[PDB]
Amino acid sequence: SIEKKEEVIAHNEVVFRSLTQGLYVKEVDIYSDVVSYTKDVDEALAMPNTINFKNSRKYKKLIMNLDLEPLNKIQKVIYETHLEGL
Amino acid sequence: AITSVDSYLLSEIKPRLNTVLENCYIIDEVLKDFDYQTRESFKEAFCGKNAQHEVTVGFNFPKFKNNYEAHYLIQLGQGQETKNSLGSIQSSYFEATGDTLVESSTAIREDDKLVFTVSKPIGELIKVEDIEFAKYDNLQVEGNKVSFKYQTNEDYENYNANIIFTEKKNDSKGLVKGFTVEEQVTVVGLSFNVDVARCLDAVLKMILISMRDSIEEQQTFQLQNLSFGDIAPIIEDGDSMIFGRPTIIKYTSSLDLDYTITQDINKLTFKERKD
């Protein structure tokens, strides 16, 4: 008995994964080649992906690397109001 | 030792600022209180090893054009004398001493002693990290190297120590004459974008906080005070305004000069008189 429902987006950012190694990028060099890795989603080279930050330039070389798999990490909070009768 | 506060500020700021802007974690720690938009924009523009945009720092009145996207501007400011000692005497030294140096030095084995080598000779040893030599160890300094007894310490043959020491210049002795000076130096960040100026000011504040652990200002430039001005349009005659928030830094330093002494007594002439 969902009386009302609402959704909120807290974060929306891109995170990259190596196809074979299964790790997530955390650091890059001056040439923008990967230097480090982590197996933790909470610590990754996050690229903002909100409305204002689309069409970036910082990570063009990183994107074109075929070994990397971009992922849209999105965090949400949803409020649900229940009326359960008496 | 005459003090040039501006040069010290520049030398402390440049590598430290570069290191701070190198990584994202420190910047995120710094900009915790700021909103998402300005924080992320500044991080995109300046932060990271591969940042395309870059900040700069330099003195005032440069004859060349200076980048106004983000720059740290320094000017010398006023100064005042605050305290003095009797006869302007600050300290007395038996051996001429220069700057205080910190050097890492791995332990080495010598036939009777463990030793550490150093780049330059030693005038005085202040501290060896995590060591309190006893009488048994018989700590001795012999020019470049410091040494302690081999046998009872033989477990530590390769101890990865580090040393805080002082350079040696001459064997002469003299007096230190000088006074204390209370100096003010002005620092302002410039940017045609006000949010960039705000973030730049915050970074400046953080590096000033971090500097307080530095050896030089711990020994030379104590009593740091800060004061911030209002965000104002630095220039209005361009196509777009320059916005900056001046900050005033205060320091206390001892301007001094070494007065050598050539008098050395080595003989005595105790004789009586007759009448």
**SS3 annotation, chain B:** CCCCHHHHHHHHHHHHHHHHHHCHHHHHHHCCCCCHHHHHHHHHHHCCCCCCCCCEEEECCCCCCCCCCCEEEEECCCEEEEECCHHHEEEEECCEEEEEEEEECCCEECCCEEEECCCCCCCEEEEECCCCCCCCCCCEEECCEEEEECHHHHHHCCCCCEEEEEEEEECCEEEEEEEEEEEEEEEEEEECCHHHHHHHHHHHHHHHHHHCCCHHHHHCCEEEEEEECCCEEEECCCCCCEEECCEEEEEEEEEEEEEEECCCCCCCCCCCCCC
Token match 């652990």: residue?
Answer: B213
CB B74 within 8 A of CB B56: no
User: CB distance B49–A53 less than 8 Å?
Assistant: no
User: CB distance A48–B44 less than 8 Å?
Assistant: yes
Q: Does A29 touch chain B (CB under 8 A)?
A: yes
User: CB distance B50–A29 less than 8 Å?
Assistant: yes
The DSSP line for A5-48 is EEEEEEEEEEEEEETTT--EEEEE-TT--EEEEES-TTSS--EE
Residues of A in contact with B52 (CB under 8 A): 57-58
Resolution, angstroms, 1 dp? 4.2
Residues of B in contact with A52 (CB under 8 A): 37
The whole-angstrom separation of Cα B210 and Cα B20 is: 11
Q: Please give the single-letter amino acid code of residue B108.
A: I
Q: Does B29 touch chain A (CB under 8 A)?
A: no
**Which DSSP letter does residue A52 get?**
T
The whole-angstrom separation of Cα B63 and Cα B148 is: 57
The whole-angstrom separation of Cα B26 and Cα B136 is: 45
What size, in residues, is chain A? 86
CA B201 distance to own-chain centroid = 21
Token match 């080649």: residue?
Answer: A33
CA-closest candidate to residue B85, choices B221, B254, B251 = B254
CA-closest candidate to residue B236, choices B201, B199, B192 = B192
Residues of B in contact with A56 (CB under 8 A): 44
CA-closest candidate to residue B9, choices B69, B72, B99 = B72
Residues of A in contact with B54 (CB under 8 A): none
Report the gap between the CA of A22 and the closest CA in chain B (Å). 23
